[PDB]
């Protein structure tokens, strides 16, 4: 890190790994991994969450209720928590 960046932790791990996987490759993973960080969501971008709360009329406590449920059962939580909304 010192010679080529100086404190850039994320990328060194990311570029070796995605491509290392697609080395002995079935592709399946490349979709999930190429989506994984910057575009988009992964889970769902907090703006899409916010809209899907505000615009379907979910009570805050109701929303969180759902969030807990989807998180605990088979999760891999999707929805973003309240304080990040």
């Amino acid at each position: 890190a010192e010679k080529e960046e100086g404190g850039d932790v994320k990328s060194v791990c990311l570029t070796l790994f995605l491509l290392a996987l697609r080395a002995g490759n079935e592709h399946k993973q490349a979709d999930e991994l190429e989506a994984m960080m910057q575009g988009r969501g992964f889970g769902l971008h907090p703006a899409v969450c916010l809209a899907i709360r505000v615009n379907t009329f979910l009570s805050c406590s109701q929303y969180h209720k759902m969030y807990r449920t989807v998180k605990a059962t088979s999760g891999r939580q999707i929805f973003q928590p309240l304080h990040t909304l």
Binding site: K65, R68, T69, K71, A72, T73
Partner: protein, 82 residues
């Protein structure tokens, strides 16, 4: 002056037959109308949000959806086990 010939039904009922019925049922207030009544709130929202909506089918889907609201099986899931 206010109780000479007149007493409200409940003041009498609560001053007379309470010890007897608590002795008999074992308890009271667990048997209260509250567990009904409250439910009425739902009947209003389930007549707007979840209604069909026309006079024919409306009671049908309110009733159904209410039944679904009441079931334990679902609430168990919605506890999410702590």
């Amino acid at each position: 002056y206010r109780y000479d010939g007149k007493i409200t039904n409940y003041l009498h009922k609560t001053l007379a037959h309470v010890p007897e019925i608590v002795e008999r049922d074992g308890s009271i207030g667990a048997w209260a109308s509250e567990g009904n009544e409250s439910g009425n709130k739902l009947f209003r929202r389930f007549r707007k949000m979840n209604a069909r909506q026309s006079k024919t089918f409306e009671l049908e889907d309110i009733l159904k959806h209410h039944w679904l609201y009441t079931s334990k099986y679902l609430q168990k899931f919605m506890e999410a086990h702590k």
